[PDB]
From a paper:
Ubiquitin (Ub) is a small 76-amino-acid protein that functions as a post-translational modifier on a wide range of substrate proteins in the eukaryotic cell. Because Ub uses a common surface to interact with a wide variety of proteins with relatively low affinity, it is an attractive scaffold for engineering variants with greater specificity for select targets (Ernst et al., 2013, Leung et al., 2017). Using this method, we unexpectedly identified a dimeric UbV that is selective for the RING domain of XIAP (hereafter referred to as XR) (Gabrielsen et al., 2017). Using solution angle scattering and X-ray crystallography, we show that a single substitution of residue Gly10 to either Ala or Val is sufficient to convert Ub from a monomer to a dimer.
To investigate whether Ub74 G10V resembled the UbV.XR dimer, we determined the structure to a resolution of 2.23 Å from crystals grown from the dimeric gel-filtration fractions. Polder maps (Liebschner et al., 2017) confirm that the electron density for the β1β2 loop clearly extends between two adjacent chains such that β1 interacts with β2′ on a neighboring chain to form a β sheet. The complementary chains in each dimer pair have a complete elongated β1 strand. The dimer interface comprises around 1,800 Å2 of an overall accessible surface area of ∼6,000 Å2 for each subunit. There appears to be a certain degree of freedom around the dimerization arm, producing two distinct populations of dimers in the asymmetric unit. The first population consists of the chain pairs AB and IJ, which superpose with a root-mean-square deviation (RMSD) of 1.55 Å for 2,139 atoms, and the second population consists of chain pairs EF, KL, and GH, which all superpose with an RMSD of less than 0.8 Å for ∼2,000 atoms. The main source of divergence between these two populations arises due to differences in rotation between the two Ub bodies in the dimer subunits. The populations differ quite dramatically, with angles of 144° for AB, 159° for CD, and 163° for EF. A theoretical scattering curve calculated from the crystal structure fits well to the solution data with a χ2 value of 3.8 compared with the crystal structure of Ub74, which fits with a χ2 of 20.8, and the crystal structure of the Ub74 G10V dimer was easily superposed with the envelope calculated from the solution scattering data. A crystal structure of Ub74 G10V shows that the dimer interface resembles that of UbV.XR, and SAXS analyses suggest this dimer conformation is also present in solution.
Residue numbers in the entry:
A (entry chain A), B (entry chain B): 0 to 73
Write the structure that this text describes.
Amino acid sequence: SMQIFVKTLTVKTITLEVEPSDTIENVKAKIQDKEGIPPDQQRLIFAGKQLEDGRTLSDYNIQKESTLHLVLRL
Amino acid sequence: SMQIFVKTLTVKTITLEVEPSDTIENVKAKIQDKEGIPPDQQRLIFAGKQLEDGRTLSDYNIQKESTLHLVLRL
């Protein structure tokens, strides 16, 4: 009869396949391919630091099964 | 070649087909059908007010194409 919309906000953990030498920028692109989030809205955080696009995961000693935090720009 | 995890707060907006006389409990039942969230783990919000199970969409003046907000609770 009638349609309503429900906007949901959940805690979600995504898994990515990466190389220690991938840049933060390449990681944001992989997040886009999986979530449809453009890279310019993505803020990636590890151990309290904002991750810089032009650096690699190894630059931040992001190892296997490390967990990044993704926060979106408003 | 490694696996990493990215934890994010993800926004998903769902559409529901309802009648103005549907109870909130009936609406949560439809959310379960489409997202698999049981009604007691659902915190359903309209216009900043938490919606009560025994009340209808009309009671809260929820009209066509209205948007509700949902977060998960234990």
